[PDB]
Design a protein around this nucleic acid. Structure first.
Lengths: 23, 505, 102, 525, 96
DNA sequence: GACTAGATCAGAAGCAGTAGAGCATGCATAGTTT
DNA sequence: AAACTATGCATGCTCTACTGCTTCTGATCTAGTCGACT
């Protein structure tokens, strides 16, 4: 199950907040 | 997912682990210590109810519940705390490295079967219910028992027994001068072996970067706020659970401590007559409201009865086209309604049929909602939700109903009268150019609460006695520098077109 | 400690003061050396008795004490080679320090 | 501050007592409407003047009684703050009369009372509401001067009639057609023309009925006060800035008066005292002064002290009153389900500012054309925590503005996994079940497709219904005050009717519901 | 009523409550002794059981002279009733 | 019999979220005084 | 006309109750081992 949070099993890993990234 | 999470850190203490190949590169032992500290911090913030243990093997001194040789259990399975973090940090530096060598020792024979056995014993010593049993093995060696095959077979048998029991093991292989070959000996010990993770690894494991990534956010397990009853009719009835997919995040409540000794202090309240000086109970009190000169007295039970219309639950009223649901008619955060099936059988099929039919017809179900007893009823709309999953089959929007509260007449306020002023095409085009210049993609988790992050950092600094709290960069700022550099002369042209020279905003 | 320092309502003392008090088994008066912070009342008290630096006006100074006093004052660059040399020469002449070998 | 004066003209004629079998007489409906208005105006504790004029009574009492004119008209209550006495007069000691009274004469008397009593205090909103059935003879001689005086004196006029242009507030037809009389038709035409002349083609929207008025908050339409404005500057960069004013378009309403705890016997607040004490976790129960308590926080298995001064010094600090546009994103990327907060803001341009209005209109039009919303940072003041929200255009022929709603942070999102229902095999409905559900949905539709304009008309608009809790509380308080020793009354029938859908859907949703019941096995477990 | 003496149990009903009760009694004309003494005749209890009451009686007797009249064990309800009525209410089984 | 184990089911503590009450405080606007 | 004061409001904070869900704990039923007896 790729994307699973190693620290917290059963909770999907969450990407760090990237803020505003202009295109 | 019911229970707790158990994590045991196995840090190898061989000579090779205490040497650094190149300069300006932290030794693997220090890297493991930092990873353990980061995991401890993440567990403390997200969920402090979990259990973490730290065990060292390969040390001269031994400390185990069975008196196994060459194994040290630095910290038994227990809730994380600042004391354990400080104890781990004591070995962080080179002086800490010397302290660990002096008080623990290194360069001794060991058996993987022995460490697995002590880990299993530690797991069996927890009285709480453990949902996940996990072990992490920090070691840069890939062929520990290269000079003995009996130990290899014993380790294989112990790993098989642990896997059968339900223990899930990972190998956090670290940097090695020559290279790490998982396929050599550790392939048969890992619970799950990936095809990609077969070649020789000349660098650090990718899991280390993820572990070092500190996370500051409370994690809440799935839990139904209320198992309410949906009544299409006085006879037709189903059971549906209500969840809050979005909930405001509040900092932990403060606690009162005694300044002299820094211990919890119990807070109590009492009410008594100023004349009789005797304790009073809520049943020996009346509620009073004064309107001008008149006084109205009602009992507490009567006041509770005032806001009583119908029994708690959801009562269906009809179906309305989705076009009539205004986007700006927002009062409270929306909830999620999902069939339960644990109370009344056959509700799941009815819910699914209603969901698919509403999606086909694009109609939301209007209902009367009474979350609890003695609560005035409200009008809500259930909009069907289609199960949406992104690539690699990962769910992003679950199937069910989205409950949105419809504001009442009182909740609406009348705006002051204003005179419309249309904008000329040139100004609209200039604004279009500015907006296109400032285009950006938005995601639900693109911002962080600066207040909560700063509070967590301050608490960390206070607990760990750090010199200063690392300032948390806030993404909520508009970074005017980049916007100004990107816009160019558009702002000046827009101001000239719209703003008169003698305006001075 | 930094938060306490910022809130000018308490005095921050080095542990060496308590160790010395234990050594002599008596209450030793405060000195700027032991004081990391000074409350306004304590600052006023020390201003009269003691110089702004870690030096006193009444009790004399010794080799170690003068070394600590010089440690407290940090180097500054408001002087000039030529004017500094002139000031040094004037200082030597005023107190009859022309007999030095260097 | 702000004050308004209202005059309620009530018919008391014999025709008012007429009641068709199975229906309530118009007198009861008018009494209920006036009682609701007085309850709202009195229990809200607002500085508003209310006067009541009854026309159609046996007696005569009014300033215009010099000669034999304007007979059978009584000024029951002059312009004064509405006290309980008005409620008692409305409820118990007011009975239907037997002598008809001229509606025009009653309007003349009401206007004269408004003019005469508007000398001492200052009123910025003068309103006159006429409750009548238009079943009495009248003269049009004074109509021209009536309109002239109404236009000159800036007086708002509202009308309430038993019928519109059976259950009370049932979201259905009232006073079935072919029952109106010729005199009623003539009176309706006169009032229609008067309202058209006054409001200028909008007057038809100011003629309500008792059943509708009981569930539309129309009586207070011209009395409620506008909310204050929050001024700020919408900044896209470090140079551009538009002066804007934000109001609270939608906000949950709560009772401001709070129940006060008093002693059971003396019914006095003075004889009740609430004290808070702190003690250690010991059997001896050691007492600690309130000044010997330090704030702290739990860090997991231990508690770390955190002084209030230390927290204030180390807390996140930002510039207050900031409205900055972080960026622009496609409207599809922002979803309603992620909306947060307990309020919605409406942002207009600064008042009496042409340049700001033009700039805001240009921004709104550009966003609408590009189908975009603005992700912005909002902070009420220094103490207010910064928020990330979405502002989207809202363009109407009457006005255009921006609508701002708070958005969730990455810490406010819950990741819950739910089992799929489309691919599930254990809960797969059959074709007959789907057909029955489709029939039920079709039968229970609350919207009608009017083919005259090909538009969707809502038969059960829940947004316009008032909150029943306030009405229930007012009714119970009035009952307790008038009757100090009696149980609270039950919920009013009209309140239940307004909270239920029209009988048309209930009647049409019988066979589909029976089919659903017979085609779906449900049993408690 | 100088003849009658009333004492309170400090470590079982807090400090603010005891101070308030003492002030109310003094305003009502009842003398309350700050420190325990042999002259005490009435002792008031609060949220306590019989076992602890007898333990307190034994502790008091352990440091009292012989041939005396230990104060009768009495509850808060009595004190509340007496303060309400303004005069010492007669004692009955409940208080004893 | 007796006991200790083992399992197993019903009540209590903790947590999360909501409403109602009372206040800090600062930011705006209407009124009075110099 | 400008400075000071007044009210008024909003929002974040704190406490106390209230309800509902989840997990831990205490009371109650049987297998095995040793012993007693006829």
């Amino acid at each position: 199950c790729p994307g699973e949070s190693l620290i917290n099993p059963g909770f999907k890993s969450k990407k760090p907040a990237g803020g505003v990234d202009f295109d | 997912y019911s229970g707790r999470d158990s994590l045991i850190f196995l840090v190898d203490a061989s000579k090779a682990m205490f040497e650094s190949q190149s300069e300006d590169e932290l030794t693997p032992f220090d890297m493991s210590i930092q990873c353990i500290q980061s995991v401890y911090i993440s567990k403390i913030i997200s969920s402090d109810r979990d259990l973490l243990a730290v065990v060292f093997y390969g040390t001269e001194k031994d400390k185990n519940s069975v008196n196994f040789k060459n194994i040290y259990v630095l910290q038994e399975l227990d809730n994380p705390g600042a004391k354990r973090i400080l104890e781990l940090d004591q070995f962080k530096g080179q002086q800490g490295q010397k302290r660990f060598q002096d008080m623990m020792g290194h360069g001794s024979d060991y058996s993987l079967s022995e460490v697995l056995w002590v880990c299993a014993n530690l797991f069996s010593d927890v009285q709480f219910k453990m949902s996940h049993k996990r072990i992490m093995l920090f070691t840069n060696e890939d062929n520990p028992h290269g000079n003995d095959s009996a130990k290899a077979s014993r380790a294989r048998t112990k790993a098989g027994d642990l896997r059968d029991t339900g223990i899930f093991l990972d190998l956090m292989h670290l940097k090695k001068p020559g290279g790490f070959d998982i396929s050599l000996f550790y392939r048969d010990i890992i619970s799950i072996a990936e095809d990609e993770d077969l070649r020789v690894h000349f660098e650090e494991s990718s899991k280390l970067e993820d572990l070092l990534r500190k996370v500051r956010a409370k994690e809440t397990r799935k839990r139904a706020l209320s198992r309410l009853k949906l009544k299409l009719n006085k006879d037709i009835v189903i059971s549906v659970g209500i969840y809050n997919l979005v909930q405001k995040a509040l900092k932990p409540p403060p606690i009162k401590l005694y300044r002299e000794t820094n211990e919890p202090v119990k807070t109590k309240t009492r009410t008594f007559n100023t004349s009789t000086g005797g304790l009073l109970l809520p049943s020996d009190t009346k509620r009073s409201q004064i309107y001008g000169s008149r006084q109205i007295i009602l009992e507490k039970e009567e006041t509770e009865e005032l806001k009583r219309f119908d029994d708690p639950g959801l009562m269906l009223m009809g179906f309305k086209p989705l076009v009539l649901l205004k986007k700006h008619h927002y009062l409270r955060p929306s909830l999620f309604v999902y069939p339960e099936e644990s109370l009344v059988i056959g509700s799941s099929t009815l819910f699914s049929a209603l969901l698919i039919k509403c999606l086909e017809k694009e109609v939301a179900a209007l209902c009367r909602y009474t979350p609890r007893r003695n609560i005035p009823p409200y009008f809500v709309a259930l909009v069907p939700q289609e199960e949406e999953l992104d690539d690699q089959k990962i769910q992003v929007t679950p199937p069910g109903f989205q409950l949105v509260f419809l504001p009442f007449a009182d909740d609406k306020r009348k705006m002051p009268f204003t005179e419309k002023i249309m904008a000329t095409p040139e100004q609209v085009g200039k604004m279009k150019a500015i907006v296109e210049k400032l285009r950006f993609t938005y995601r639900s988790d693109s911002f962080e609460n600066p207040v909560l992050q700063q509070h967590f950092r301050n608490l960390e600094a206070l607990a760990l006695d750090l010199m200063e709290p690392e300032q948390a960069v806030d993404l909520t700022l508009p970074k005017v520098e980049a916007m100004n550099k990107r816009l160019g002369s558009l702002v000046d042209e827009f101001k000239e077109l719209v703003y008169p020279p003698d305006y001075n905003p | 400690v930094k938060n306490i320092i910022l809130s000018n309502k308490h005095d921050v003392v080095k542990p060496a003061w308590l160790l010395e008090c234990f050594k002599t088994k008596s209450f030793v008066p405060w000195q700027p050396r032991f004081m990391i912070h000074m409350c306004p009342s304590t600052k006023e008290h020390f201003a009269r008795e003691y110089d702004c630096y870690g030096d006193s006006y009444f009790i004399d100074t010794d080799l170690n004490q003068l070394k600590e006093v010089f440690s407290g004052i940090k180097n500054s660059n408001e002087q000039t080679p030529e004017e500094m040399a002139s000031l040094i020469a004037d200082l030597e002449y005023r107190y009859s320090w022309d007999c030095s070998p260097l | 501050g702000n004050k308004a004066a209202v005059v309620l003209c009530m018919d008391v004629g014999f025709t008012m007592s007429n009641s068709i079998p199975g229906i309530e007489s118009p007198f009861e409906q008018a009494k209920k409407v006036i009682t609701m208005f007085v309850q709202r105006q009195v229990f809200a504790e607002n500085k508003d003047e209310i006067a009541l004029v009854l026309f159609g009574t046996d007696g005569t009492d009014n300033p215009l009684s010099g000669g034999d004119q304007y007979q059978n008209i009584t000024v029951h209550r002059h312009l004064m703050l509405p006290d309980f006495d008005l409620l008692e007069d409305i409820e118990s000691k007011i009975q239907p009369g037997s002598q008809q009274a001229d509606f025009l004469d009653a309007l003349i008397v009401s206007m004269d009372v408004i003019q005469h009593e508007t000398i001492g205090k200052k009123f910025e909103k003068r309103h006159i509401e006429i409750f009548t059935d238009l079943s009495s003879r009248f003269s049009k001689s004074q109509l021209d001067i009536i309109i002239h005086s109404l236009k000159k004196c800036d007086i708002s006029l509202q009308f309430f009639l038993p019928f519109s242009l059976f259950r009370l507030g049932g979201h259905g037809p009232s006073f079935p057609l072919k029952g109106i009389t010729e005199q009623q038709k003539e009176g309706l035409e006169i009032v229609k023309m008067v309202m058209i002349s006054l409001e200028g083609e909008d007057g038809l929207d100011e003629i309500y009925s008792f059943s509708e008025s009981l569930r539309k908050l129309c009586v207070f339409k011209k009395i409620e006060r506008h909310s204050i404005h929050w001024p700020c500057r919408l900044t896209i960069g470090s140079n551009l800035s538009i002066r804007i004013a934000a109001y609270k378009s939608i906000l949950q309403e709560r009772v401001k008066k709070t129940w006060t705890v008093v002693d059971a016997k003396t019914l006095k607040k003075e004889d009740i005292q609430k004290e808070t004490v702190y003690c250690l976790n010991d059997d001896d129960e050691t007492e600690v002064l309130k000044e010997d308590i330090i704030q702290g926080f739990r860090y997991g298995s231990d508690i770390v002290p955190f002084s209030k001064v230390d927290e204030e010094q180390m807390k996140y600090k930002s510039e207050g009153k900031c409205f900055s546009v972080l960026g622009f994103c496609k409207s599809s990327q922002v979803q309603r389900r992620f909306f947060m907060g307990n309020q919605v803001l409406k942002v207009f341009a600064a008042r009496d500012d042409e340049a700001a209005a033009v700039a805001l209109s240009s921004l709104i039009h550009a966003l609408d054309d590009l189908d975009m919303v603005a992700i912005v940072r909002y902070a009420y003041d220094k103490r207010a925590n910064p928020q990330v929200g979405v502002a989207f255009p809202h363009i109407k022929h009457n006005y255009e503005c921006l609508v701002y709603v708070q958005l969730p942070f990455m810490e406010d999102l819950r990741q819950y996994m739910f089992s799929s229902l489309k691919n599930s095999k254990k809960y797969a409905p059959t074709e007959a079940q789907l057909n029955a559900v489709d029939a039920l949905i079709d039968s229970m539709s609350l919207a009608k497709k009017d083919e005259k304009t090909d538009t969707l008309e809502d038969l059960f608009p829940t947004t316009k219904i008032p909150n029943p809790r306030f009405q229930r509380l007012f009714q119970c308080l009035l009952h307790r005050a008038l009757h100090p020793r009696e149980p609270l009354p039950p919920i009013q029938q009209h309140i239940w009717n307004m909270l239920n859908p029209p009988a048309e859907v209930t009647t049409k949703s019988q066979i589909p519901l029976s089919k659903i019941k017979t085609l779906f096995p449900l049993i408690e477990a | 009523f100088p003849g009658v003496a009333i004492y309170l149990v400090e470590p079982r009903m807090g400090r603010s409550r005891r101070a308030f009760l003492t002030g109310l009694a003094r305003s009502k004309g009842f003398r309350v002794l700050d420190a325990c003494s042999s002259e005490a005749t009435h002792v008031v209890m609060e949220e306590t059981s019989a076992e602890e009451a007898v333990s307190w009686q034994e502790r008091r007797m352990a440091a009292a002279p012989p041939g005396c009249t230990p104060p009768a064990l009495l509850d808060i309800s009595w004190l509340t009733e007496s303060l309400g009525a303004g005069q010492p209410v007669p004692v009955e089984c409940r208080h004893r």
